[PDB]
From a paper:
A number of predicted genes that showed similarity to carbohydrate active enzymes (CAZymes) were selected for expression leading to the discovery of the first exo-1,4-β-xylanase from glycoside hydrolase family 11 (GH11).
The final model was constructed from the first to last residue of the crystallized protein, which was cloned without the first 13 residues that were predicted as a disordered region and reported as a signal peptide. The curvature of the β-sheets B1 to B9 forms a cleft where the catalytic residues (nucleophile Glu98 in β-sheet B6 and proton donor Glu200 in β-sheet B4) are located. Here, we show that loop EL2 blocks one side of compost21_GH11 active site, transforming this enzyme into an exo-1,4-β-xylanase that acts from the non-reducing end.
Residue numbers in the entry: 1 to 216
The structure:
Amino acid sequence: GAMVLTQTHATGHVGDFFFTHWKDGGSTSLTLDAEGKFLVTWQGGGYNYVGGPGWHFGDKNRVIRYKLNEETGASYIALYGWGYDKTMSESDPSHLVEYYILQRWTYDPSQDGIYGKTFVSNGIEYSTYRSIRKVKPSINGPTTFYQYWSKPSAQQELGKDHKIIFADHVKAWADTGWILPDMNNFDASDDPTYQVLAVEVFNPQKNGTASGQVWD
């Protein structure tokens, strides 16, 4: 009922759960079982990691539940995913969209974004931001695309069951005219339009652990 991912790059399923797992070096590993329990342990010494458990596809009505038992300081923990419309012009930055719903962070990755609006979801106050990536990596290769962010007004604590109500963030982005392209396809060259609870660790100074469970 589990995989221990230690390779530099891997995607796939463990039972009902999808995962993506990316490393530019080092011994960082992701363990995931079929009940959505996950464990990321990272090296400490300056490589980068992005990975976590989730669904290959973005469901506009998904209610994501998770709890973190351990989180020693990963650059950020965020719901993380993609939308992609193969019929749209590739010079239109909305043809492909990377989106983040941040739960915790050492530094704020949304700081380059332009503010959209503030709203409440599951009793949590969020603010939204939109930035652009110019000729950067993506599920469809190097391209120029928008990033949509939702950032909570406080860090989400460990040891508690949290909820991310994806419909609320889709709506908040749409409220400012930020539309998500199709989130249920494989049309892109490199990856499906997945949606995962990502553990992101950039240039870590100390060894680290993030563990918990995700479900919907």
